């Protein structure tokens, strides 16, 4: 959709993979504020907001914290902190037509600058003059919106750019959004370190006879010692035995 009517999707309770974002090369900008792109899969996020729109290339500088411009002032405002990433890629082939692509519009005129993360879908005629406008278009009455007018041949600056903004609302609230944690192969009867289910430990892993149900993830015994656990990848229960040690 257009920049003034920017689409918002609420994203939560998922395994948020960002490897696809890294792998693709068609993208132009991965500008991230308050967060490291390589560690997106590492942290857990309370909630994600996906803002999708299409902008002019020369205006991609206005999608940034503490920035000013017609798009920034009247179309889309980004907070100064904004722990999140703006990802923009050129879309000249997809979003330009023979003649003019007038389907996409931006708001020329507005009474005041909109607050961060505010959407103004109003189509009321703006009164630039002293005389009351009363819903007509005149010398000082102007339609707020105006089309991009994309052509097949256009300057890089004036060619369309598809932009997606990620509003990562960090909070102590339940972490709905978490990156993939990756995994490793299992190891048979040998003294190894392990981090099953987040439980760090050292020992040998043996196939066991202890049995239980999904009411459990990991096992223990007397004196609060972990001596069994099911691996998440196989749901197989293994005894943890301390690595061989003793005096000499």
């Amino acid at each position, epitope marked *: 959709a257009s920049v003034y009517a920017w689409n918002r999707k609420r994203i939560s309770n998922c395994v948020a993979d960002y490897s696809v974002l890294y792998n693709s090369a068609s993208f132009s900008t991965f500008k991230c504020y308050g967060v490291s792109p390589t560690k997106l899969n590492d942290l857990c996020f309370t909630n994600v907001y996906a803002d999708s729109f299409v902008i002019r290339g020369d205006e991609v500088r206005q999608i940034a914290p503490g920035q000013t411009g*017609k798009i920034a002032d009247y179309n889309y405002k980004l907070p100064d902190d904004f722990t999140g990433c703006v990802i923009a890629w050129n879309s000249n082939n997809l979003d330009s037509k*023979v*003649g*003019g692509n*007038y389907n996409y519009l931006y708001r*020329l*005129f507005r009474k005041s600058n909109l607050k961060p993360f505010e959407r103004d879908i109003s189509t009321e*005629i703006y009164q*630039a003059g002293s*005389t009351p406008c*009363n*819903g*007509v*278009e*005149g*010398f000082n*009455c*102007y339609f707020p919106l*105006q089309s991009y*007018g994309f*052509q*097949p*041949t256009n300057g890089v600056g004036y060619q369309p750019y598809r932009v997606v903004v990620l509003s990562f609302e960090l909070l102590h609230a339940p972490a709905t959004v978490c990156g993939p944690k990756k995994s490793t192969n299992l190891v048979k009867n040998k003294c190894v370190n392990f981090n099953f289910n987040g439980l760090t430990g050292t020992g040998v892993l043996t196939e066991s006879n202890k049995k239980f149900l999904p009411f459990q993830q990991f096992g223990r015994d007397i004196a609060d010692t972990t001596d069994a656990v099911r691996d998440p990848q196989t749901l197989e229960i293994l005894d943890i035995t301390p690595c061989s040690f003793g005096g000499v």
Partner: antibody, heavy 117, light 111 residues
Framework: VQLQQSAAELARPGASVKMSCKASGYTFTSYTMHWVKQRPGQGLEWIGY????????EYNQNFKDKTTLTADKSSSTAYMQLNSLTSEDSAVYYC???????????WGQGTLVTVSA | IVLTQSPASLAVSLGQRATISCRASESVDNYGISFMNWFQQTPGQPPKLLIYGSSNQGSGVPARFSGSGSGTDFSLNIHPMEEDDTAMYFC?????????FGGGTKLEIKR
């Protein structure tokens, strides 16, 4: 958005001419409307405009006295009144609609008015 | 505001650049944007909106037409000139109440 005017009216000097411009394809209530003259083989000169909803007309100093600008929202049309016609008034006139930040944005055909005895 | 239109009668061959220049007594840019407007009129037809603003192209306008400029200086570039381009081209200023047009340029195919 289409504009249909009258056709080639003939008047003697000293008479009065009332002529019409109907507009279709749009509201006709949300756009101010402009009038333009053009003498044969000459430049284009704007006369004046009106807001259809409120009877506010603005004319040039040149055309303030002799020109009268009216509109009818019920029939969605426009009317020109020319009084005390002279030889210089013989020309082709153009009916213009507001749009795209332009005063005379959309132009409709034209009326050839000839003032001679 | 008075508009002066340099060359107002230009003849170039088909497929060649056709440039018409427009200047104003005062500045044409207001509210950031530019209020220079560009029209085309063929014989027997009323003028049509072609270029609104300094650079933005009008509805039903080929990519051949290109308007550019700022302040008081504006230009029309016509690189792939076609047969239909033979017409009279006009300037317009929209900031002030008195609407004044340019000189008017009749474009003809050169042979």
């Amino acid at each position: 958005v289409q504009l249909q005017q009258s056709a080639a009216e003939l008047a003697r000097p000293g008479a009065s001419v009332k002529m019409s411009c109907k507009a279709s394809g749009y509201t006709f209530t949300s756009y101010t409307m402009h009038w333009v003259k053009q003498r044969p083989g000459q430049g284009l000169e704007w006369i004046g405009y009106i807001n259809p909803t409120s009877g506010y007309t603005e004319y040039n100093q040149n055309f303030k006295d002799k020109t009268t600008l009216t509109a009818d929202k019920s029939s969605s049309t426009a009317y020109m009144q020319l009084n005390s016609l002279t030889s210089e008034d013989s020309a082709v006139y153009y009916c213009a609609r507001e749009g795209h930040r332009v005063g005379p944005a959309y132009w409709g055909q034209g009326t050839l008015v000839t003032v001679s005895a | 505001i008075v508009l002066t239109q340099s060359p107002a009668s230009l003849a170039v061959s088909l497929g060649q650049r056709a440039t018409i220049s427009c200047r104003a007594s005062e500045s044409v840019d207001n509210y950031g944007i530019s209020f220079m407007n560009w029209f085309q009129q063929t014989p027997g037809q009323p003028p049509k909106l072609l270029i609104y603003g300094s650079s933005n192209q009008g509805s039903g306008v080929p990519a051949r037409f290109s308007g550019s400029g700022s302040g008081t200086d504006f230009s029309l570039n016509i690189h792939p000139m076609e047969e239909d381009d033979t017409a009279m081209y006009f300037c317009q200023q929209s900031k002030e109440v008195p609407y004044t047009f340019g000189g008017g340029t009749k474009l003809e195919i050169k042979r």
